[PDB]
Design a protein around this ligand. Structure first.
Ligand SMILES: NC(=O)[C@H]1CCCN(C(=O)Cc2cc(F)c(F)cc2Br)C1
Ligand SMILES: [Zn+2]
Length: 139
């Protein structure tokens, strides 16, 4: 679990969005596993606007942060789960690092701010949904 809070927006994995997220929906994209909802309180986070390919992510299944080298956002095949059919997920970045079910929502950050959130994983890989291209989160 986990979310990004920026301005009057909350960014979560679409497959973990709550009834309240959907009742306050701003934007969602199943192909990216992202959903953004509106908030009344001002958020704690800032978003990176960069092309970094190294950073640090939070891994809830180890209660620890790990450094990672990650690929640029791209279209990657993701196997079927109880949440989605087998499909290509867009704007996804892969890295070698631990992850297991329950780790979605952990934040990935570089020196410039928040880069994205854990969205996929398996066999010593971890995948992150990028948020750096969502320029409207800042206004
Ligand atoms: N973005 C998606 O389609 C997600 C939806 C939830 C399920 N998805 C996962 O990848 C879960 C997962 C499985 C593992 F074996 C692992 F090591 C780490 C994770 Br996270 C795809
Ligand atoms: Zn950066």
């Amino acid at each position: 679990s986990g979310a990004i809070y920026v301005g009057n927006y909350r960014v979560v994995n679409r497959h973990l969005a709550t009834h309240n997220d959907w009742a306050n929906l701003v934007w969602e994209d199943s192909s990216r596993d992202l959903l953004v909802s509106s908030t009344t309180a001002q958020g704690c986070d800032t978003i990176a606007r960069c092309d970094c390919q190294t950073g640090v992510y939070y891994c809830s299944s180890r209660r620890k942060h790990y450094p990672v080298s990650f690929s640029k956002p791209s279209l990657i095949f993701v196997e079927a789960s109880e949440y989605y059919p087998a499909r290509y997920q867009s704007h996804l970045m892969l890295a070698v690092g631990h992850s297991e079910p329950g780790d979605c929502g952990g934040i990935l950050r570089c020196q410039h701010g928040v880069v994205g959130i854990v969205s996929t994983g398996g066999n010593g890989l971890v995948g992150f949904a990028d948020v750096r291209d969502l320029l409207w989160l800042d206004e």
